[PDB]
Structure 1
Amino acid sequence: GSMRICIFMARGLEGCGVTKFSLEQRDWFIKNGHEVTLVYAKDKSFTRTSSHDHKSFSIPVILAKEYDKALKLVNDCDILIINSVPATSVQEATINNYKKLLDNIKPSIRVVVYQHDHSVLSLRRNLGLEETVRRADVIFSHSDNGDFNKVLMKEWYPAPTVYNFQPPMDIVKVRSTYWKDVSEINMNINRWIGRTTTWKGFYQMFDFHEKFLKPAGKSTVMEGLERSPAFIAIKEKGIPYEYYGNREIDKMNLAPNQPAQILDCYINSEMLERMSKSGFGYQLSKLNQKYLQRSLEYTHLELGACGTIPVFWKSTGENLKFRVDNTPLTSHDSGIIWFDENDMESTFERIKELSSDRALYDREREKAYEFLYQHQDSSFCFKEQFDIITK
């Protein structure tokens, strides 16, 4: 009903899914007639702060020394949406003032908390999440069976209702901006996008390239594999690769019989353009079923929306439920290739078929785009969330 919305990332602007969600959320609220202020605590900085285009509208605030500025911001809205909380690495002043903010927000402001993390390992790396949840008037999580719901919430309430949510994207806009004529897509390029955490399936991508793609003369690119501590393991296993920074992308060896070409971190818009011209995009996220309900990740949606053939993790499609009828995603003729770890041959065979038949290729991606649109477009999902928020 035409309200003022303050979207708050108290952990900081990290540049990944929480930042992307906040940006898509802002867009939806603006598109639907509401006013939005996007605020983030800058007490902690992150590598991917520039990955998304937010600087022309985001408002940074140092919780440690600008409590007053933060307080006026969060209190100048009708609905306060908190998508992240301070990390366990911040100084006492930061968590102290954050907690102080929670206590001094007008009682009338509707506080909505979205928990974006899955594993308890990540959930524990938060400070003030308990007081955040206690002040929340509405709470969303990615799964009724996840650690947030089954571990933390039971720990705090031995209780408010926790609603499920999917992180939506304006899939129409992405396509309108990057979709390419199939004739301009290089069937030899296989592009994986993700992060350096085991459940993103980087090991499986290296394995698939070594056993099927490389031998078949194809090229593999992996974007987003930052050299964080987790990357140490890739070095210890002795996996072959060629690493490139963001200022040396054009110096990437995209010829056959080459190791996987790795990119550190990417600018979202630049990646979408490269992907729109890539034969196959890979998103191998493979979370434990307990974390899956209806949520695909932004990288899943980005593949389908930009026009490449999406290659997803089978068990992920099997354990996720289509938004329209709650049926497994794998039960639909979506055009998506469900990467099978125990049978990569069939996976590569499907890829071969598509690579040699532009018509079949085009038909299949059109199916993927419409399937993904129906499943997680902002026009549907944010409306569901809005109804729950204003319930």
Structure 2
Amino acid sequence: MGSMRICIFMARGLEGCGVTKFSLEQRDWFIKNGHEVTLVYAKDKSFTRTSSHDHKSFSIPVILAKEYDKALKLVNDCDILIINSVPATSVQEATINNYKKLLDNIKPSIRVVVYQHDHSVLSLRRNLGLEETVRRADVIFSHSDNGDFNKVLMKEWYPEAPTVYNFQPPMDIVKVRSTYWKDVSEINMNINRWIGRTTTWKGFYQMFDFHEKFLKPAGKSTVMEGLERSPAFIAIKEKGIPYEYYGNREIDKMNLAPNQPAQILDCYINSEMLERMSKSGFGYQLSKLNQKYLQRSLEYTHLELGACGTIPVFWKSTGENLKFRVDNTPLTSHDSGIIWFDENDMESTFERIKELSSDRALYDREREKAYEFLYQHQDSSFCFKEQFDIITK
């Protein structure tokens, strides 16, 4: 096949999280493969993390609620329209109304591709127009065959077509490495860095646990990145938990020294973090996702850890519930390097951390296999090729 013009549409806005990251990585790949790519997003709703990713140079903001004409032209200008998000249940009638409008005036030639990115129904039920989007769509992707998308909504709308293929949010792992990788001689093995967001399932509570019980009592330092301000702290606070908060402006005032509680950081720049991470001894990404929602998809923050040369420390459960991209075997059942964080036998998890904190050689060996495991499981070189073939089939 030849070259096609792809329009990557984010109708929910640019949230600066997985959906933004995915859109971006998706952009870089079509481009890297000889394809014209525009990236449109609804500016109608504004988001906190609108600067975590570098995109202000090519993203094309539009305001459904007024610039309908502008939007209508953009979307109708391509061979493939990829929809990664839809308006949120908080936008004004105009916005949503005009978005439903766009779905009706797409040249029937164009090939609409919907990517459902959320898992739980609590999330899906916060969308507006998702049905008009799915109906008009020609190809549909989701994270799990057993997720609330394929199982709940999909059968709701269609009491009985169409085929919802599977996908994994790819990342050009090779590139992040050749940009942030470091020499083990430069990695403070004492810095334990967790990244995610103030959402119970990303597993920030457990990080706190693992610090007050093993990390801190060993002279180690813990930095928890990405916890936006939220009432969820109300809980954290008088739940009896010490920590120190830093605005992304106070990042240089963190106490990365011993016998110090959890150093927090509300929001961050992908790149800035990767850098910080690359010189970190152990990154922790502890999403404890429900098994109904897991299949082949690791989150971007899983990919970034192994990507920049730090020992990945993911949630044991998740590794058990995810199947490798090649042989389709469990993740936990591989010599990846991945220190599987054991919520129960934590002590055991801490032992493997100390075993590598002192053996620099072992380290490199563990992170090399980890880099390669993940690279093999969900790198953009494979995942987008697997998807593109589905779309163009």
Instruction: Label 1:221 to 1:166 Cα distance change in 2 as closer, same or farther (>3 A).
Output: same
Q: Deviations over 1:234-275 (max 9, x none)?
A: 224131100000000000000111010000000110000000
Any stretches of 5+ residues in structure 1 without a counterpart? none
Q: What is the Cα deviation at residue 229 of structure 1?
A: 3.3
1:216 matched residue in structure 2: 218
- Out of 241, 244, 266, which is 1:242 matched to? 244
- Corresponding position of 2:46: 45
> Any idea what the Cα deviations from partners look like across 1:266-285, whole Å, max 9, x if unmatched?
01100000000000000001
- Partners of 1:11 and 1:220 lie apart in 2 by 34
State the shift of 1:138 in Å. 0.2
Q: Per-residue deviation at 1:389?
A: 0.5
Aligned partners of 1:220, 1:201: CA distance in 2, in Å?
14
Tell me by how many angstroms 1:93 deviates.
0.4
Pairwise CA distance, 1:376: 0.3
Q: Distance in 1 between matches of 2:65 and 2:192?
A: 45
**Superposed displacement of residue 154, structure 1:** 1.0
CA distance in 1, matches of 2:197, 2:151: 26
Match of residue 283, structure 2, among 281, 284, 309: 281
User: After superposition, what is the alpha-carbon deviation per residue over 1:159-191, rounded to whole angstroms, capped at 9, x for unaligned?
Assistant: 210011000000000000000000100000000
CA distance in 2, matches of 1:64, 1:230: 32
Query: Paired residue for 2:143?
Result: 142
Give SS of 1:48's match: coil
Q: Deviations over 1:123-146 (max 9, x none)?
A: 111000011000110000000000
CA distance in 2, matches of 1:53, 1:116: 21
Q: How far is the alpha carbon of 1:12 from its aligned partner?
A: 0.2
Deviations 1:96-148 (A, max 9, x none): 00000000111111000001101111111100001100011000000000011
What is the CA–CA distance in structure 2 between the aligned matches of 1:167 and 1:2, rounded to whole Å? 23
Q: RMSD of the TM alignment (CA)?
A: 0.6
Identity %: 100
* Alignment partners' CA distance in 1, 2:102 and 2:246: 42
Task: Give 1:231 deviation, angstroms.
Answer: 3.3
The 1:110/1:231 distance shift into structure 2, 3 A limit, reads farther
Give the CA deviation at 1:354. 0.5
| Cα distance in structure 2, aligned partners of 1:262 and 1:121 | 28
- In structure 1, distance between residues paired with 2:233 and 2:97: 33
Q: Give TM-score scaled by structure 1 length.
A: 0.99
Give the 3 Å change call, closer, same or farther, for CA 229–148 of structure 1 in structure 2: farther
CA displacement 1:199-247 (0-9 Å, x = unmatched): 1000000000010001011000000011123333222413110000000
1:296 maps onto 2:298 in alignment: yes
Whole-angstrom CA distance in 2 between matches of 1:60 and 1:234: 37
- Find the counterpart in structure 1 of residue 32 from structure 2: 31
Kindly state the Cα deviation for residue 89 of structure 1 after the two structures are TM-superposed: 0.5
Deviations 1:26-60 (A, max 9, x none): 00000000000000000000010000000000000
Query: SS of the residue aligned with 1:108?
Result: coil
**Equivalents in 2 of 1:361, 1:325: separation in Å?**
26
Which segment is superposed worse, 153-162 or 138-147?
153-162
The CA distance in 1 between the partners of 2:16 and 2:76, in whole Å, is: 25
Match for 2:315 among 313, 316, 323?
313
TM-score when normalising by structure 2: 0.99
Cα distance in 1 for residues equivalent to 2:250 and 2:94: 40
Three-state SS of the structure 1 residue aligned to 2:77 is coil
Please, which moves more after superposition, 76-85 or 236-245? 236-245
Residue 105 of structure 2 corresponds to which residue in structure 1? 104
Distance in 1 between the 2:122 and 2:64 partners?
Answer: 25
**Secondary structure in 2 aligned to 1:281?**
strand
SS of residue matched to 2:345: helix
Work out the CA distance in 2 between the residues paired with 1:67 and 1:233: 43
Q: Deviations over 1:311-357 (max 9, x none)?
A: 00001000000001100001110000000001100000000000010
Distance 1:243 1:121 in 2: 29
State how far apart, in whole Å, the 1-side matches of 2:239 and 2:290 are: 24
Distance 1:273 1:95, change over 3 A: same
Give distance in 2, aligned partners of 1:30 and 1:113.
19
Listed as ranges, the matches of 1:263-282 within 5 Å are: 263-282=265-284
| Secondary structure in 2 matching 1:55 | coil
Aligned positions, number: 391
SS of aligned partner of 1:65: helix
Q: SS of 2:284's equivalent?
A: strand
* Corresponding residue SS for 2:66: coil
For 1:40 and 1:253, the matched residues in 2 are separated by 38
Take 2:142 and 2:93, find their aligned partners in 1: how far apart are those partners?
27
Shift of 1:78: 0.3
The equivalent of 1:124 in structure 2 is 125
Give 5+ residue unaligned stretches, structure 2: none
Look up the SS of the partner of 2:332 in the other structure.
helix
SS at match of 1:367: helix
Aligned partners of 1:7, 1:346: CA distance in 2, in Å?
45
Q: Match of 1:187, SS?
A: strand
